[PDB]
């Protein structure tokens, strides 16, 4: 099983920015897509962003389009979730997870432990 | 887009019996691109079934499912205690966005 | 001559049928099987052959035939096939997914039904895992549903693996008793003795 | 006498295959030709050899193994063969009539499929005449199908000769993207540079 290290959760004021990372090891990174999914505490999971296995093709959910910016690197073997101007509805646990496909579609097999991300004033 | 759920079966069952899970599609999803997770209350979801007819790694044979066109069924043969969790619908393979339905809580009584 | 007619009678006309958890296995060898008497009959209601025709069934020689005799209810006769699921399938009998042979059944509401309940018959309700194909499990180990060991004692999360069958002549057909006698065919290096009538 | 594995796995685990109008060609040399890796790996379907058997790939010494890697539609996988003629084999990858080699293909729907539409795995639609065996046609030159001269401008009857199939995951199992590799080799005529493990 490939392990996933979700890291970079914290407390950030509304209108701030935060930098999540998900370190991954146990498969060929350039071959399978990375997905980014929220769950706000005690309510349903919602997908937020995804990135192709190569590193170029990306998508984002309509509530975070133009605020969230995904990126990756085949050198450090990790995916970044850079986000700006967070709102109160952006509080969640984030989970990084690998999809079965090289470009973002398909289902998610292995999932990180997840990280708390809190927005408050 | 593609809608789903139709989740009765949340009725609190007891350990060690057969439970069947309904999943109704509205457009007859193609290539049987359906999948099921389990999540226990405070841990990451884990995939159980994909291809709507293919078990993933690290999944006991206790889980099984089948379906085609508008109608899919996850059929768990019996119920060990760790199976008291939430199960999800997850249509995938179109404008990805990913998809998470309401769920199904099976509890103890 | 044609002699040593296979003893299909003793198994189809048996006065008592094994329970679905304790299912008999008769082994046929050194006899001519006159399947024509079986497949040209009338009472039988279900005869489903997988990979074999009942007309071709007259012209074969095989090493042995098994006769897996048991009693089930009407809703459970559909579970006696390759690739089936259900309580009876998952806790009493698997047909192999590549099964070759035939499944035969008939209603028994004249013999195996009683006015005050005939429960001599009994199915396996609880178990840890599913059977292997053609496995038989007659154990009376108390199922441990919880983590607390039962030590063969019944109680909370400690239930008998066997639930009794409710059988009355006035019961709906999906619950009335049925006799099933699964027939399988096997080929080994040993002499092929189960010939058809020719 | 040589003991150094060659990049077969690479040719197979290559991140990105090229389009079938511009199929790659690797010179395999100084190899121990461990073909166990190919039919030991999980999916690796349709292991079809011609003039050779898949199990007899370890008691041979080939002169010059050529690995040709590309991606095609699922329906065309059968046209990557000797004596075939249709759309794929006529103008993008002709096998010779006397091919000694192994064509290997596996479904790459999980890998070469865009749900927003895939427009990078081009194939050639129009060409005046068939390709001779092992010809690479990277020509981007426009093709005249009408009476109007194309004059370096694309338009009505002035097609770009190259276009992508488009690969959505929801496309029929018939036409999902299939990764293909073709192992050409010559038998005994020269000092062999690749030999099986012996």
Coordinates of C-alpha atoms in Angstrom, one line a residue:
Chain A
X1 CA 0.0 0.0 0.0
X2 CA 1.3 3.5 -0.8
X3 CA 1.5 5.7 2.3
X4 CA 0.3 9.3 2.3
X5 CA 1.6 12.1 4.7
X6 CA -1.0 14.9 4.8
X7 CA 0.7 18.0 6.5
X8 CA 0.3 21.8 6.7
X9 CA -3.1 22.2 8.5
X10 CA -3.5 25.2 11.0
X11 CA -5.6 28.2 12.0
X12 CA -5.8 31.1 9.4
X13 CA -7.9 34.3 9.6
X14 CA -10.7 34.9 6.9
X15 CA -9.1 36.4 3.8
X16 CA -5.7 34.7 4.7
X17 CA -3.7 31.9 2.9
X18 CA -2.5 28.4 3.6
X19 CA -0.1 25.8 2.1
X20 CA -1.1 22.1 2.4
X21 CA 1.3 19.3 1.3
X22 CA 0.7 15.6 0.8
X23 CA 3.9 13.6 0.7
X24 CA 3.5 10.2 -1.2
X25 CA 5.6 7.1 -1.6
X26 CA 4.9 3.5 -2.9
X27 CA 3.9 4.0 -6.6
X28 CA 5.1 5.8 -9.8
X29 CA 3.9 9.5 -9.3
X30 CA 4.0 10.5 -13.1
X31 CA 1.5 7.5 -13.7
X32 CA -1.5 8.1 -11.3
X33 CA -3.6 11.3 -10.5
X34 CA -3.7 13.0 -7.1
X35 CA -7.1 14.2 -5.7
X36 CA -8.0 16.7 -2.9
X37 CA -11.2 16.3 -1.0
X38 CA -12.7 18.1 2.0
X39 CA -15.0 17.0 4.8
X40 CA -16.4 19.9 6.9
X41 CA -16.6 18.5 10.6
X42 CA -19.8 16.4 10.9
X43 CA -21.2 17.1 7.4
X44 CA -20.8 15.4 3.9
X45 CA -17.5 15.1 2.0
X46 CA -17.0 17.5 -0.9
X47 CA -14.3 17.3 -3.6
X48 CA -12.2 20.6 -3.9
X49 CA -9.4 20.0 -6.4
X50 CA -7.5 17.4 -8.4
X51 CA -4.3 17.2 -10.5
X52 CA -3.2 14.8 -13.3
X53 CA -0.5 12.3 -12.7
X54 CA 1.9 14.1 -15.0
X55 CA 1.4 17.4 -13.2
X56 CA -0.2 19.6 -15.8
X57 CA -4.0 18.9 -16.0
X58 CA -6.0 20.2 -13.0
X59 CA -9.6 21.0 -11.9
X60 CA -11.2 22.7 -8.9
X61 CA -14.7 22.7 -7.4
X62 CA -16.9 25.9 -8.2
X63 CA -16.7 27.1 -4.5
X64 CA -12.8 27.3 -4.7
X65 CA -12.3 28.2 -8.5
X66 CA -10.0 31.2 -8.7
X67 CA -9.1 31.0 -4.9
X68 CA -7.3 27.6 -4.7
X69 CA -4.2 26.8 -6.8
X70 CA -2.9 23.2 -7.0
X71 CA 0.8 22.2 -7.9
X72 CA 3.2 19.3 -7.6
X73 CA 6.8 18.1 -8.3
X74 CA 8.3 14.8 -9.5
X75 CA 11.6 15.8 -7.6
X76 CA 10.2 15.9 -4.0
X77 CA 7.4 13.4 -5.0
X78 CA 4.6 15.6 -3.4
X79 CA 1.5 17.6 -4.2
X80 CA 0.8 21.1 -2.9
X81 CA -2.6 22.8 -2.1
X82 CA -1.9 26.5 -2.1
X83 CA -5.1 28.5 -1.2
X84 CA -5.9 32.2 -0.7
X85 CA -8.8 34.3 0.6
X86 CA -10.4 31.4 2.7
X87 CA -14.0 32.0 4.0
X88 CA -15.7 30.6 7.1
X89 CA -17.3 27.8 5.0
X90 CA -13.7 26.6 4.0
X91 CA -13.2 25.0 7.5
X92 CA -12.7 21.2 7.2
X93 CA -10.5 18.2 7.5
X94 CA -8.7 17.8 4.2
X95 CA -7.8 14.4 2.8
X96 CA -5.3 13.8 0.0
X97 CA -6.0 10.7 -2.0
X98 CA -4.7 8.9 -5.2
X99 CA -7.1 8.2 -8.0
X100 CA -7.0 5.1 -10.2
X101 CA -6.4 7.1 -13.3
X102 CA -3.6 9.2 -14.7
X103 CA -5.8 12.1 -15.6
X104 CA -8.3 13.2 -12.9
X105 CA -11.3 11.0 -13.0
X106 CA -12.1 7.6 -11.6
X107 CA -12.2 6.6 -7.9
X108 CA -9.8 7.0 -5.0
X109 CA -8.1 3.9 -3.5
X110 CA -5.6 5.1 -0.8
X111 CA -6.3 8.1 1.5
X112 CA -4.2 10.2 3.8
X113 CA -4.8 10.3 7.6
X114 CA -6.1 13.9 6.8
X115 CA -5.4 17.3 8.4
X116 CA -7.5 19.9 10.4
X117 CA -7.8 23.2 8.6
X118 CA -9.6 25.9 10.7
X119 CA -10.7 29.4 9.8
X120 CA -11.7 31.7 12.7
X121 CA -11.2 35.4 13.7
Chain B
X1 CA -25.8 15.5 -14.0
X2 CA -26.0 11.9 -12.4
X3 CA -28.2 11.5 -9.3
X4 CA -28.3 8.4 -7.0
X5 CA -28.8 7.4 -3.3
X6 CA -32.2 6.0 -2.5
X7 CA -30.8 5.0 0.9
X8 CA -33.1 3.1 3.2
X9 CA -31.1 0.2 4.9
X10 CA -29.8 2.5 7.7
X11 CA -32.0 0.5 10.1
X12 CA -29.9 -0.6 13.1
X13 CA -28.9 -4.2 12.4
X14 CA -27.1 -6.6 14.8
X15 CA -23.6 -8.0 14.3
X16 CA -23.3 -11.0 12.0
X17 CA -26.3 -10.9 9.6
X18 CA -26.8 -10.2 5.9
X19 CA -27.4 -6.6 4.8
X20 CA -28.1 -5.4 1.3
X21 CA -27.5 -1.8 0.2
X22 CA -29.6 -0.3 -2.7
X23 CA -28.1 2.2 -5.2
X24 CA -30.3 3.6 -7.9
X25 CA -28.9 5.4 -10.9
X26 CA -30.9 7.8 -13.1
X27 CA -29.2 7.5 -16.5
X28 CA -27.8 3.9 -16.5
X29 CA -24.2 4.7 -15.8
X30 CA -21.8 3.4 -18.4
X31 CA -19.1 0.7 -18.0
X32 CA -20.4 0.1 -14.5
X33 CA -18.2 2.9 -13.2
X34 CA -19.4 2.7 -9.6
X35 CA -17.5 2.3 -6.3
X36 CA -18.2 2.0 -2.6
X37 CA -16.2 3.3 0.4
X38 CA -16.5 2.6 4.1
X39 CA -15.7 5.3 6.7
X40 CA -15.8 4.7 10.5
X41 CA -16.8 8.0 12.5
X42 CA -13.3 9.7 12.7
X43 CA -11.0 8.1 10.1
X44 CA -10.4 8.6 6.3
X45 CA -12.7 6.7 3.9
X46 CA -11.3 3.4 2.4
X47 CA -12.4 2.0 -1.0
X48 CA -14.1 -1.5 -0.9
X49 CA -15.5 -2.1 -4.4
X50 CA -14.8 -0.4 -7.7
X51 CA -15.9 -1.2 -11.3
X52 CA -19.2 -1.9 -9.5
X53 CA -18.0 -5.6 -9.7
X54 CA -14.3 -5.7 -8.6
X55 CA -12.9 -5.8 -5.1
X56 CA -10.0 -3.6 -4.2
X57 CA -6.8 -4.6 -2.3
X58 CA -7.0 -5.1 1.5
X59 CA -10.8 -5.8 1.3
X60 CA -12.2 -9.0 2.9
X61 CA -14.4 -11.1 0.7
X62 CA -17.2 -10.2 3.2
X63 CA -18.0 -7.3 0.8
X64 CA -19.5 -8.0 -2.6
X65 CA -21.7 -6.1 -5.1
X66 CA -23.3 -6.2 -8.6
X67 CA -25.4 -4.0 -10.8
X68 CA -26.1 -2.7 -14.3
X69 CA -28.2 0.0 -16.0
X70 CA -30.1 2.0 -13.4
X71 CA -29.8 -0.5 -10.5
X72 CA -26.8 -1.4 -8.3
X73 CA -26.6 -3.4 -5.0
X74 CA -23.8 -3.7 -2.5
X75 CA -24.5 -7.0 -0.6
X76 CA -22.5 -7.7 2.6
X77 CA -22.8 -11.3 3.6
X78 CA -22.5 -10.7 7.3
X79 CA -21.5 -8.0 9.7
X80 CA -18.3 -8.0 11.9
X81 CA -18.2 -5.0 14.3
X82 CA -15.9 -2.8 12.2
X83 CA -18.5 -2.8 9.5
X84 CA -20.8 -0.5 11.5
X85 CA -19.9 2.5 9.3
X86 CA -21.1 4.8 6.6
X87 CA -21.2 3.6 2.9
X88 CA -21.1 5.9 -0.2
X89 CA -22.4 5.9 -3.8
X90 CA -19.6 7.5 -5.9
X91 CA -20.6 7.7 -9.5
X92 CA -17.3 8.5 -11.3
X93 CA -16.1 8.9 -14.9
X94 CA -17.8 12.1 -16.1
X95 CA -16.7 15.8 -15.8
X96 CA -15.0 14.5 -12.8
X97 CA -15.9 16.7 -9.9
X98 CA -16.1 13.5 -7.9
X99 CA -19.4 12.5 -6.2
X100 CA -20.3 11.7 -2.6
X101 CA -24.0 10.8 -1.9
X102 CA -25.8 11.1 1.4
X103 CA -24.4 7.8 2.7
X104 CA -25.9 4.9 4.8
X105 CA -25.2 4.6 8.6
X106 CA -25.7 1.0 9.8
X107 CA -25.7 1.1 13.7
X108 CA -26.2 -1.4 16.5
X109 CA -29.5 -2.3 18.2
Chain C
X1 CA -27.4 -56.7 -21.9
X2 CA -28.1 -53.5 -20.1
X3 CA -27.8 -54.5 -16.3
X4 CA -27.0 -52.8 -12.9
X5 CA -29.5 -49.9 -13.3
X6 CA -28.0 -47.1 -11.2
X7 CA -29.8 -46.8 -7.8
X8 CA -31.4 -43.3 -8.6
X9 CA -34.6 -44.7 -7.0
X10 CA -33.1 -45.1 -3.4
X11 CA -32.1 -41.4 -3.6
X12 CA -35.2 -39.8 -5.3
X13 CA -37.7 -42.0 -3.3
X14 CA -35.8 -41.7 0.1
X15 CA -38.4 -41.5 3.0
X16 CA -36.2 -39.1 5.0
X17 CA -34.1 -36.3 3.3
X18 CA -30.9 -34.8 4.9
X19 CA -31.1 -31.2 6.2
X20 CA -29.5 -28.5 4.1
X21 CA -26.5 -28.1 6.6
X22 CA -26.1 -32.0 6.8
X23 CA -26.7 -32.7 3.1
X24 CA -26.1 -36.3 2.0
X25 CA -23.6 -37.2 -0.8
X26 CA -24.3 -40.5 -2.5
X27 CA -21.5 -41.7 -4.8
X28 CA -22.5 -43.6 -8.0
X29 CA -20.1 -46.0 -9.8
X30 CA -20.3 -49.5 -11.5
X31 CA -23.9 -49.0 -12.8
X32 CA -25.8 -47.8 -16.0
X33 CA -27.5 -44.4 -15.3
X34 CA -31.0 -44.4 -17.0
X35 CA -31.4 -40.6 -16.8
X36 CA -34.4 -41.0 -19.3
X37 CA -36.5 -42.1 -16.3
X38 CA -35.5 -38.9 -14.4
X39 CA -35.8 -36.3 -17.3
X40 CA -39.0 -37.8 -19.0
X41 CA -40.9 -37.6 -15.6
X42 CA -43.7 -35.2 -14.7
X43 CA -43.8 -34.3 -10.9
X44 CA -40.4 -32.5 -11.2
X45 CA -40.9 -28.7 -11.4
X46 CA -37.3 -27.5 -11.9
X47 CA -34.5 -29.1 -14.0
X48 CA -31.6 -26.7 -14.8
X49 CA -28.5 -28.2 -16.5
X50 CA -25.4 -26.0 -16.8
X51 CA -23.2 -27.0 -19.8
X52 CA -25.1 -30.3 -20.3
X53 CA -28.3 -31.1 -22.4
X54 CA -30.9 -33.6 -20.9
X55 CA -31.2 -35.2 -24.4
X56 CA -27.4 -35.7 -24.7
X57 CA -27.4 -37.0 -21.1
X58 CA -28.3 -40.6 -22.4
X59 CA -24.9 -40.9 -24.4
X60 CA -22.2 -40.3 -21.7
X61 CA -19.7 -42.3 -19.6
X62 CA -18.1 -40.7 -16.4
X63 CA -16.0 -42.0 -13.4
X64 CA -18.6 -41.0 -10.7
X65 CA -21.8 -39.1 -10.1
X66 CA -22.4 -37.4 -6.8
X67 CA -26.0 -37.1 -5.5
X68 CA -26.2 -34.2 -3.0
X69 CA -29.6 -34.6 -1.4
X70 CA -31.2 -31.9 0.9
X71 CA -34.4 -30.0 1.8
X72 CA -34.9 -26.2 1.4
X73 CA -37.9 -23.8 1.0
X74 CA -39.3 -22.3 -2.2
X75 CA -37.5 -18.9 -2.0
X76 CA -34.1 -20.7 -1.7
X77 CA -34.4 -23.1 -4.8
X78 CA -33.1 -20.1 -6.9
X79 CA -29.9 -19.9 -4.8
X80 CA -28.9 -23.5 -5.9
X81 CA -26.9 -22.5 -8.9
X82 CA -23.3 -21.3 -9.9
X83 CA -22.6 -17.7 -8.8
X84 CA -25.5 -17.4 -6.4
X85 CA -25.8 -15.6 -3.1
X86 CA -28.2 -15.7 -0.1
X87 CA -28.3 -17.3 3.4
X88 CA -28.7 -20.9 2.1
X89 CA -26.0 -20.4 -0.5
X90 CA -23.5 -18.7 1.8
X91 CA -24.0 -20.9 4.9
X92 CA -25.1 -24.3 3.5
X93 CA -23.9 -25.0 0.0
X94 CA -21.9 -23.4 -2.9
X95 CA -22.1 -24.7 -6.4
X96 CA -18.8 -24.0 -8.1
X97 CA -18.9 -21.0 -10.5
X98 CA -17.8 -23.3 -13.4
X99 CA -20.4 -26.0 -12.4
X100 CA -21.1 -28.8 -14.8
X101 CA -24.2 -31.0 -14.3
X102 CA -27.8 -30.5 -13.3
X103 CA -30.0 -29.3 -10.4
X104 CA -33.4 -31.0 -9.9
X105 CA -36.2 -30.1 -7.5
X106 CA -39.8 -30.8 -6.6
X107 CA -42.4 -29.7 -4.0
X108 CA -42.8 -31.9 -0.8
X109 CA -45.9 -30.3 0.9
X110 CA -47.5 -33.8 1.1
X111 CA -44.5 -35.5 3.0
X112 CA -42.2 -32.9 4.7
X113 CA -45.1 -30.6 5.9
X114 CA -47.0 -31.2 9.2
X115 CA -50.2 -29.7 10.7
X116 CA -48.5 -28.6 13.9
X117 CA -45.1 -27.7 12.2
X118 CA -42.4 -30.0 10.7
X119 CA -39.1 -28.6 11.9
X120 CA -37.0 -31.8 11.5
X121 CA -35.4 -29.6 8.8
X122 CA -32.9 -26.8 9.7
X123 CA -30.5 -24.3 8.0
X124 CA -27.2 -22.8 9.1
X125 CA -27.9 -19.2 10.1
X126 CA -24.6 -17.8 11.4
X127 CA -21.0 -18.4 10.5
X128 CA -17.6 -16.6 10.3
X129 CA -16.9 -17.3 6.6
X130 CA -18.5 -18.7 3.4
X131 CA -18.1 -22.3 2.2
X132 CA -15.7 -23.7 -0.3
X133 CA -17.6 -25.5 -3.2
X134 CA -18.9 -28.9 -2.2
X135 CA -17.8 -28.3 1.5
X136 CA -20.1 -29.7 4.3
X137 CA -20.1 -28.1 7.8
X138 CA -22.1 -30.0 10.5
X139 CA -20.4 -28.4 13.5
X140 CA -22.6 -27.2 16.5
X141 CA -20.0 -24.6 17.7
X142 CA -22.0 -21.6 19.2
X143 CA -21.3 -18.6 17.0
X144 CA -19.5 -15.7 18.7
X145 CA -21.0 -12.5 17.3
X146 CA -19.3 -10.4 19.9
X147 CA -15.6 -10.3 21.1
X148 CA -16.5 -12.1 24.4
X149 CA -15.7 -15.8 24.1
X150 CA -18.7 -18.0 24.5
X151 CA -16.9 -21.3 25.5
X152 CA -19.8 -23.2 23.8
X153 CA -22.3 -21.4 26.0
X154 CA -25.3 -19.4 24.5
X155 CA -26.2 -15.9 25.5
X156 CA -25.5 -12.3 24.5
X157 CA -23.6 -12.4 21.2
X158 CA -23.6 -16.2 21.6
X159 CA -26.2 -17.8 19.3
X160 CA -26.7 -21.3 17.9
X161 CA -25.4 -21.5 14.3
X162 CA -28.6 -23.4 13.3
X163 CA -32.1 -22.0 13.0
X164 CA -35.1 -24.4 12.6
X165 CA -37.4 -24.4 9.5
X166 CA -41.2 -23.6 9.9
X167 CA -43.1 -26.1 7.7
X168 CA -46.9 -26.4 7.6
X169 CA -49.1 -27.5 4.6
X170 CA -51.0 -24.1 4.6
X171 CA -47.7 -22.1 4.3
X172 CA -47.0 -20.1 1.2
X173 CA -45.2 -21.9 -1.7
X174 CA -42.0 -19.8 -1.3
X175 CA -41.7 -21.3 2.2
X176 CA -43.1 -24.9 1.7
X177 CA -40.5 -27.7 1.8
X178 CA -38.8 -28.7 -1.5
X179 CA -36.5 -31.7 -2.1
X180 CA -33.3 -30.9 -4.1
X181 CA -30.8 -33.6 -5.4
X182 CA -27.8 -31.9 -7.1
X183 CA -26.1 -34.1 -9.6
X184 CA -22.4 -33.5 -10.5
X185 CA -20.1 -35.3 -13.0
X186 CA -16.3 -35.9 -12.5
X187 CA -13.4 -37.2 -14.8
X188 CA -10.3 -38.9 -13.2
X189 CA -7.7 -41.4 -14.4
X190 CA -9.8 -44.2 -12.7
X191 CA -12.2 -46.3 -14.8
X192 CA -15.2 -44.5 -16.3
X193 CA -18.1 -46.6 -14.9
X194 CA -21.3 -44.4 -14.9
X195 CA -22.4 -45.0 -18.5
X196 CA -25.8 -44.0 -20.0
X197 CA -28.4 -46.6 -21.4
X198 CA -27.1 -46.8 -25.0
Chain D
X1 CA 28.5 -14.3 -22.6
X2 CA 26.8 -11.2 -21.1
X3 CA 25.0 -10.5 -17.7
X4 CA 23.1 -7.2 -17.8
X5 CA 19.3 -6.8 -18.0
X6 CA 18.2 -4.5 -20.9
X7 CA 15.4 -1.8 -20.7
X8 CA 12.5 -4.0 -21.7
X9 CA 10.5 -3.0 -18.6
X10 CA 11.2 0.7 -19.4
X11 CA 9.8 0.2 -23.0
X12 CA 6.8 -1.2 -21.2
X13 CA 6.6 1.0 -18.1
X14 CA 7.3 4.2 -20.2
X15 CA 5.4 7.1 -18.8
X16 CA 4.0 8.4 -22.2
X17 CA 3.7 6.4 -25.4
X18 CA 3.9 8.3 -28.7
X19 CA 1.0 8.5 -31.2
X20 CA 0.8 5.8 -33.9
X21 CA 1.8 8.2 -36.7
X22 CA 5.1 8.8 -34.8
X23 CA 5.7 5.4 -33.0
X24 CA 9.1 5.0 -31.2
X25 CA 11.7 2.4 -32.1
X26 CA 14.2 1.2 -29.5
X27 CA 17.4 -0.8 -30.4
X28 CA 17.7 -3.6 -27.8
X29 CA 21.3 -4.9 -27.7
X30 CA 23.6 -6.6 -25.1
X31 CA 20.5 -8.0 -23.3
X32 CA 19.8 -11.2 -21.2
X33 CA 16.2 -11.2 -22.7
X34 CA 14.3 -12.2 -19.4
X35 CA 10.8 -12.6 -21.1
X36 CA 9.4 -13.9 -17.7
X37 CA 8.7 -10.2 -16.7
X38 CA 6.2 -9.8 -19.6
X39 CA 3.9 -12.8 -19.0
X40 CA 4.5 -12.7 -15.2
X41 CA 3.1 -9.1 -14.9
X42 CA -0.6 -8.8 -14.2
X43 CA -2.7 -7.6 -17.3
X44 CA -0.3 -7.7 -20.3
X45 CA -3.0 -9.3 -22.5
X46 CA -3.0 -10.8 -26.0
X47 CA 0.6 -12.0 -25.9
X48 CA 0.6 -13.0 -29.6
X49 CA 3.8 -14.2 -31.2
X50 CA 4.2 -15.1 -34.9
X51 CA 6.8 -17.7 -36.0
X52 CA 7.7 -18.0 -32.3
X53 CA 5.8 -19.3 -29.2
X54 CA 5.5 -17.1 -25.9
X55 CA 7.2 -19.9 -23.8
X56 CA 10.1 -20.4 -26.3
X57 CA 11.5 -16.9 -25.6
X58 CA 14.3 -18.1 -23.3
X59 CA 16.1 -20.8 -25.5
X60 CA 16.8 -18.2 -28.3
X61 CA 19.5 -15.8 -29.4
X62 CA 18.1 -13.0 -31.6
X63 CA 20.3 -10.7 -33.8
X64 CA 18.7 -7.3 -33.1
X65 CA 15.5 -6.9 -31.0
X66 CA 13.5 -3.8 -32.0
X67 CA 10.8 -2.6 -29.6
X68 CA 8.2 -0.3 -31.3
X69 CA 5.8 1.4 -28.7
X70 CA 2.6 3.3 -29.5
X71 CA -1.2 3.7 -28.6
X72 CA -4.2 2.8 -30.8
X73 CA -8.0 2.2 -30.4
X74 CA -9.2 -1.1 -29.0
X75 CA -10.9 -2.3 -32.3
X76 CA -7.6 -1.8 -34.2
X77 CA -5.5 -4.1 -31.9
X78 CA -6.2 -7.0 -34.4
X79 CA -4.9 -4.9 -37.4
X80 CA -1.4 -4.8 -35.7
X81 CA -0.7 -8.2 -37.3
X82 CA 0.9 -9.7 -40.5
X83 CA -1.4 -9.6 -43.7
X84 CA -3.9 -7.1 -42.2
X85 CA -5.3 -4.0 -44.0
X86 CA -7.8 -1.3 -42.8
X87 CA -7.2 2.2 -41.4
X88 CA -4.3 1.8 -38.9
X89 CA -2.0 -0.7 -40.7
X90 CA -2.4 1.0 -44.1
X91 CA -0.9 4.5 -43.3
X92 CA 0.6 4.5 -39.7
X93 CA 2.1 1.1 -38.8
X94 CA 2.3 -1.7 -41.4
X95 CA 3.6 -5.0 -40.2
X96 CA 5.3 -7.1 -43.0
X97 CA 3.6 -10.3 -44.3
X98 CA 6.7 -12.3 -43.0
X99 CA 6.9 -11.0 -39.4
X100 CA 8.8 -12.9 -36.7
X101 CA 8.0 -11.2 -33.4
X102 CA 5.5 -10.6 -30.6
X103 CA 2.7 -8.1 -30.6
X104 CA 1.6 -7.3 -27.0
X105 CA -1.3 -5.0 -26.0
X106 CA -3.1 -4.0 -22.8
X107 CA -6.1 -1.8 -22.1
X108 CA -4.8 1.7 -21.1
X109 CA -8.2 3.3 -20.4
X110 CA -7.2 3.9 -16.8
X111 CA -4.1 5.8 -18.2
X112 CA -4.7 7.5 -21.5
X113 CA -8.2 8.9 -21.1
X114 CA -9.3 12.5 -20.5
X115 CA -12.8 13.1 -19.3
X116 CA -12.6 16.6 -20.8
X117 CA -11.6 15.0 -24.1
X118 CA -8.1 13.8 -25.1
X119 CA -6.5 15.6 -28.0
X120 CA -2.9 14.5 -28.0
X121 CA -3.0 10.9 -29.3
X122 CA -3.2 11.7 -33.0
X123 CA -3.4 9.2 -35.8
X124 CA -3.2 9.8 -39.6
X125 CA -6.5 9.9 -41.5
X126 CA -5.4 10.7 -45.1
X127 CA -2.4 9.5 -47.2
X128 CA -2.2 8.8 -51.0
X129 CA -0.9 5.1 -50.8
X130 CA 0.0 2.4 -48.2
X131 CA 3.1 2.4 -46.0
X132 CA 5.8 -0.2 -46.7
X133 CA 6.7 -2.2 -43.5
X134 CA 8.3 -0.2 -40.6
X135 CA 7.8 3.3 -42.2
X136 CA 7.5 6.4 -39.8
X137 CA 5.3 9.1 -41.4
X138 CA 5.8 12.2 -39.2
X139 CA 4.8 14.4 -42.3
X140 CA 2.6 17.3 -41.2
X141 CA 2.2 18.3 -44.9
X142 CA -1.5 19.0 -45.7
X143 CA -3.4 16.7 -48.1
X144 CA -5.5 17.8 -51.1
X145 CA -8.9 16.0 -51.2
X146 CA -10.7 18.7 -53.3
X147 CA -10.1 20.4 -56.7
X148 CA -8.9 23.6 -54.7
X149 CA -5.1 23.7 -54.1
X150 CA -4.4 23.9 -50.4
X151 CA -1.5 26.5 -50.7
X152 CA -0.4 26.1 -47.0
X153 CA -3.9 26.9 -45.6
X154 CA -6.2 24.4 -43.9
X155 CA -10.0 24.4 -44.8
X156 CA -12.8 22.7 -46.6
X157 CA -11.2 19.7 -48.5
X158 CA -7.8 20.8 -47.1
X159 CA -7.5 18.7 -43.9
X160 CA -4.8 18.4 -41.4
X161 CA -3.8 14.7 -42.0
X162 CA -3.5 14.1 -38.2
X163 CA -6.3 14.1 -35.6
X164 CA -6.8 12.6 -32.1
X165 CA -9.5 9.9 -31.4
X166 CA -10.6 11.5 -28.1
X167 CA -10.5 9.3 -25.1
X168 CA -13.2 9.6 -22.4
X169 CA -13.3 7.0 -19.6
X170 CA -17.0 6.5 -20.5
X171 CA -16.2 5.4 -24.0
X172 CA -17.2 1.9 -25.1
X173 CA -14.9 -0.9 -23.9
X174 CA -14.5 -1.5 -27.6
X175 CA -12.6 1.7 -28.4
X176 CA -10.8 2.7 -25.1
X177 CA -7.1 3.5 -25.7
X178 CA -5.0 0.3 -26.0
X179 CA -1.2 0.6 -25.4
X180 CA 0.7 -1.6 -27.8
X181 CA 4.3 -2.7 -28.1
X182 CA 5.7 -4.7 -31.0
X183 CA 8.8 -6.8 -30.5
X184 CA 10.4 -7.3 -34.0
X185 CA 13.5 -9.5 -34.1
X186 CA 15.5 -11.6 -36.7
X187 CA 16.5 -15.2 -35.9
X188 CA 19.8 -16.9 -36.9
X189 CA 22.0 -15.1 -39.5
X190 CA 24.6 -13.1 -37.5
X191 CA 26.4 -12.8 -34.1
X192 CA 23.5 -12.5 -31.6
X193 CA 23.6 -9.5 -29.2
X194 CA 20.5 -10.7 -27.2
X195 CA 20.1 -14.2 -25.7
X196 CA 17.7 -15.8 -23.2
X197 CA 18.8 -16.7 -19.6
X198 CA 21.1 -19.8 -20.0

